[PDB]
Ligand binder design. Structure first.
Ligand SMILES: OC[C@H]1O[C@H](O[C@H]2[C@H](O)[C@@H](O)[C@@H](O)O[C@@H]2CO)[C@H](O)[C@@H](O)[C@@H]1O
Ligand SMILES: OC[C@H]1O[C@H](O[C@H]2[C@H](O)[C@@H](O)[C@@H](O)O[C@@H]2CO)[C@H](O)[C@@H](O)[C@@H]1O
Ligand SMILES: OC[C@H]1O[C@H](O[C@H]2[C@H](O)[C@@H](O)[C@@H](O)O[C@@H]2CO)[C@H](O)[C@@H](O)[C@@H]1O
Ligand SMILES: OC[C@H]1O[C@H](O[C@H]2[C@H](O)[C@@H](O)[C@@H](O)O[C@@H]2CO)[C@H](O)[C@@H](O)[C@@H]1O
Lengths: 402, 402, 402, 402
């Protein structure tokens, strides 16, 4: 519904979208404007697909890394908070949503992965990845496991892969050298080899995903998981006595998570840009709107200073920020898209044994060094959801990309 | 689509297509099968576009260099001539139409560019590229120019670009290394600089194309042109007293044109491939059949031994084969269209001043380094000719190439 | 396009097109001219779309009501049969194909809908629409329904809509007043309310279409259907013991179907109009030629006198002509497609509950009041099938209609 | 150039576009952002044509009557002046640019037509239209004429046509009855008949246009003209001693000009919406920016109160506002488009004698009563400037309009 007079909002299924709908319901009450909160699959790839043809939602929620590609494709309206409102949010969150000198999204919350452990099974969890094998051997004799976490999304494995020196793009003086990529280097090989060794040695399963790992931790079947603050409420529900701590170190060096700022952008094709701004600034980015959402699924360390002053006292948030400090804020450059695509394939191929670690990371590097809109776009395009008219605009749009 | 019981043939506009239809009419009269000869513009692009879908002609004529890409795209039937027929043609012409061990077309005639000169204006044509400036200077007084030829198609400029060392792809053993490209080497630079200098120094105009150069020569306005046998008949209609001879040398080395073998491929989707086979084998590739086309526009050095014995007595044909010998048969690899794209841009951009020679030839190199099945097919389609449903099929077809 | 020396024919999918091709094969054997019989979906729309451009078949078969619009768009050749041939067909069938004094098609057969009933389930079929509810009530016990017929095409619902006074356009003198429309009068309302009430009261389902109603009858699941002669052969294959009879009365008045004359028009752009003329005149419109089609699917009451003398002995044909007499030959004016559009929406919207009967029939009226050449052609094209260049031609073609 | 990083501005050729470019030059100097001011032909019909396909300028200048159609077609961004800036402009100018509760453009200036007369030829010009014949008879004996004004644009004749009761749409309580149109009524017939009588009697020429009338007044060939403030600077240049006064009355009732507010909207497809706003609010709508433009071609009675306080003392401005008071502020409803289209045709057809006054105004009414996007759009479409891709989006856009 690219309907004027309405707001349509997209956000990932793991965030507090019932919470957000409650904020929509306060906006409809005060204003009469209906808000529909939807959480469709793969929405970070659908958005650029349908916004290109002037469709999609008024408001898109995602971590900030995808937004520079959006802004570059002219898919986002420039947001114009006054100084009084900008002063409400931590300066480094605004930096994460600035692209080519324009603010292209409102920052909502800072996310980092942490080690979450069952204190009943494991009151003193391991400081190192290298201890996990022996600890799994121990828990196996009891029909349990040391560690389960989503191995389907490179976001979850990247902190291990980066530990010993893997990187996406080289950061120098204020700028990413997109010709300097480090997914194929010795440090990235070391961390992926360690992961694959865990599966080879039957300490993890290659096919473990988000939901398999959540159920296992939440039922008492595995001692540890890796996950971000959004996950904590399902763990409360399970009554498991859990702690949130620093990720284990690897080769005597910290795991270095990629730090994401959940952000909200306004589709540049939206006929509702003023309503979107009123909803975001006046309803969502308040102690009340952030609480509604956070009480649903935890946001992390929110962008809003007044509300953050409270949540910062939560030792789980302390631990999140501790982990964020060891990792790095994601780049928002357009190539992040190619980075994730490449690494996802490499991790799955290495984990399942279809490829060696060496073969996998060298194709991931080759894929990144071969990134260019026209083959790349074809790679992110889902034609099963293109109408003939959308496919034609896309054939032009791709002739011109070029 | 394409209907059974009839043949549709496509052949380029500069070829003897009325001659060709004379052969078709003999065929319908003997056979009861109607032959429709068509000469659509940009056919070497239109072909891959419509044959992809199982439409297009039964028979396609073009120089052999496009046929590798068409065969790789599954568009051509492997042809099936017996040994006795194969014995009738020259083995080198069969090599030009062999792709991964398969015969993908019937060769027709060998085409090389020669220097064509007006014997009244210039009875002793230039041995070297280097003397042409002074000659143009001298012709100016008479209201004439030294030389005009098509600068819009890199085919006509290649011979000079290659003379001092430019090459498409390195040929070491039996193979073409697609990684080792020679459009940007010292010889390619020196050849193109000499062309640009001809333009800078007002001896040629960047804008000159096929029809412009042809009019000027045939109207006795320019002393020389560079063209292939198909042009001789318009010259003859013109009564210009012309000769055909070896291209001039550059830095003391022959001009090296890229030699094409005009070939007929059978569309893989054609229901008439036996009919195609009988027409081509028993009608076209005969003394009688080839004479009818060559009498419309000359074909060059024909592939069929018995007829070439005749043609080869003609000094314009010895001139053609001299140039052919000095140049190189074109590769037929999929990557040739990428080559020709890249070089077409370089020549037009350098001739126009839009780029230096070094800038233009670097960009030609980079482009060839970044080719792939997907983008080559893309260089091939214009969206202006695709329906939305077709575009949607193209998005899938494109995806399957990535 | 369209090639000389051959015929391409389009005929609707529910007709005897294999029979028709049998006539074509006799024609090729006598004539040496190949006949290609095609039955594309939505042909009565696809025809105006491709014939506008001078493409499409040589011959088009449809009921006469579409032929006024096709002739007005300059798409049909005026046919040229001599008096002796014209004497062979019935004068009323020639009137159906006359437009502004010109013969625009050869009539083939008269089509009217009848009540078809299962003689085992219902040996005495209902005289009146009004009794069908109680009959359905009684059939329910047996696991059967009273009546199922296509509710998606207003052709099948019109007979009841017209019974009590609905009409398309008023016919006073010799002419149809396009200003005086009768889709929204008291009789049209009463007829449609009775259909909607059948649905409200669970005696029919809004969703029922051609193939659904056909399966149900032919599988012995429903006692009655409403359909034309073309359906009888599937019923026969079915061994259902069926009869064909007069439609039931409504408010004491005959059902009045809109009677079509299945006709063949010659495409104005066809290069084979003498061949079309010889096939139609001397092959199709013969005892032998019509028997071959009618043996595939029955044609109805054929236009050719000598063959109808035979067919008319068949009680299913007397039933057809009874219904034909009680209903009205369709006008052939350009405005008939607008009529059918308008009523198709009304019936579907009323049957679905989306609109009351009064709302739906008012909107049908308004629509017909607002028709024009431009928007009628628009109801005809789908952009999904137009290339951009074609679309541009359509914008001009459309402008020339305003 | 839908280039981000640039502003492209469209404004009519009769406004001070050299002036406006000087404001662009101050914006480029202070900001580095290039501004291109263009004045293309028929820009009020091109804008909706090219903005529909995401092309056109960042900023469009036109009188406010066209903007409600634009806003309705989703072609305009909502503008969001703060209260401090809105307070700078007269409240009634903001009303003129509000559509469906959104401000859709910045108001610049109020325009009304006045009677401009040569005080040397005619020190006491006529209070009535009915005096013009005798006064022309008098000036003719001297090789001069009473009155010449653009008869090609209904804007110039509408005040006479409305005098005795012609109207576009009936205005009641706060709303236009679009079903109540008055171009065919007795008052509109009376004023058009008077115009046509002037031409019949050789007092005016049907073909006199803007430029013919300007030259004539400006050279001393005609005593009077009708025109808005933009025209006054060319009259200064001519040194003609002119006055600006109330339009003559007709049938003892005032001429009732349609009053236009020159406005500036921001294309909703612009990637430069923030720059556009900075330029409009901060550079143009200042005493300095308005003066730059006004010193070029007079704007009328500007929207900006501080600058208006000065120009209001100009007796020419007093006379403009006197005339505005007798006429009416144009509606901005989407149907204004159809209104002008209809009346333009009627005036030209009546003036040239191809149609009687009665025939002309009744077709204009019939055209208005038949207004609907799909025939209407086809009427405003210029396909000579559509690319194939633009034409396809338009065939969809029009299928959907609907
Ligand atoms: O795995 C690649 C993927 O990782 C990140 O996505 C995170 C997201 O940021 C979190 O909020 C949560 O949803 O987990 C996701 C991983 O499943 C990047 O944000 C995303 O762009 C990237 O593709
Ligand atoms: O200019 C690039 C072009 O060169 C060759 O085309 C020749 C063709 O072989 C000749 O038969 C003649 O028609 O002139 C053409 C150039 O105008 C290659 O065969 C072709 O693939 C390539 O694009
Ligand atoms: O439903 C509207 C439709 O009715 C008629 O079409 C009939 C056709 O005449 C018969 O031959 C048979 O095939 O069924 C069709 C309906 O499914 C009109 O002839 C047609 O123009 C109209 O749109
Ligand atoms: O004539 C119909 C036309 O009139 C008005 O246009 C005016 C414009 O407002 C003035 O600023 C000046 O340019 O003269 C124009 C008439 O030529 C309406 O503004 C316009 O929409 C309408 O079509």
């Amino acid at each position: 519904m690219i309907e004027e007079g309405k707001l349509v909002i997209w956000i990932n299924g793991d965030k507090g979208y019932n919470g957000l709908a409650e904020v929509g319901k306060k906006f409809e009450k005060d204003t009469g404007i209906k808000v529909t909160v939807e959480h469709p699959d793969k929405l970070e790839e659908k958005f650029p697909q349908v916004a290109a043809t002037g469709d999609g939602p008024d408001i898109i929620f995602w971590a900030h890394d995808r937004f520079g590609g959006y802004a570059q494709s002219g898919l986002l309206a420039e947001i114009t908070p006054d100084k009084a409102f900008q002063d409400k949010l931590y300066p480094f969150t605004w930096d994460a949503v600035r692209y080519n000198g324009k603010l292209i999204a409102y920052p909502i919350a800072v996310e980092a992965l942490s080690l979450i452990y069952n204190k009943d099974l494991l009151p003193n969890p391991p400081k190192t990845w290298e201890e996990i094998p022996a600890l799994d051997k121990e828990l196996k004799a009891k029909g349990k496991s040391a560690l389960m976490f989503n191995l389907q999304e490179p976001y979850f494995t990247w902190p291990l892969i980066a530990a010993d020196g893997g990187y996406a793009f080289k950061y120098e003086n204020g700028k990413y050298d997109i010709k300097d990529v480090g997914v194929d280097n010795a440090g990235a090989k070391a961390g992926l080899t360690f992961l694959v060794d865990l599966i080879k040695n039957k300490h993890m399963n290659a096919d473990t995903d988000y939901s398999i790992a959540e159920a296992a931790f939440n039922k008492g079947e595995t001692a540890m998981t890796i996950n971000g603050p959004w996950a904590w409420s399902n763990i409360d529900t399970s009554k498991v006595n859990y702690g949130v701590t620093v990720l284990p170190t690897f080769k005597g060096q910290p795991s270095k998570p990629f730090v994401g700022v959940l952000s909200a952008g306004i589709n540049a094709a939206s006929p509702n840009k003023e309503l979107a701004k009123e909803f975001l600034e006046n309803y969502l980015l308040t102690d009340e709107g952030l609480e509604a959402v956070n009480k649903d699924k935890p946001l992390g360390a929110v962008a809003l200073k007044s509300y953050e002053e409270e949540l910062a006292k939560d030792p789980r948030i302390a631990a999140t920020m501790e982990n964020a400090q060891k990792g790095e804020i994601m780049p928002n450059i357009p190539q992040m898209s190619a980075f994730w695509y490449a690494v996802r394939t490499a991790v799955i191929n290495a984990a399942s044994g279809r490829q060696t670690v060496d073969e996998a990371l060298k194709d991931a590097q080759t894929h990144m060094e071969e990134t260019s809109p026209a083959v790349e776009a074809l790679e992110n395009l889902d034609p099963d959801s293109l109408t003939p008219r959308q496919a034609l605009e896309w054939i032009y749009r791709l002739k011109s990309l070029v």
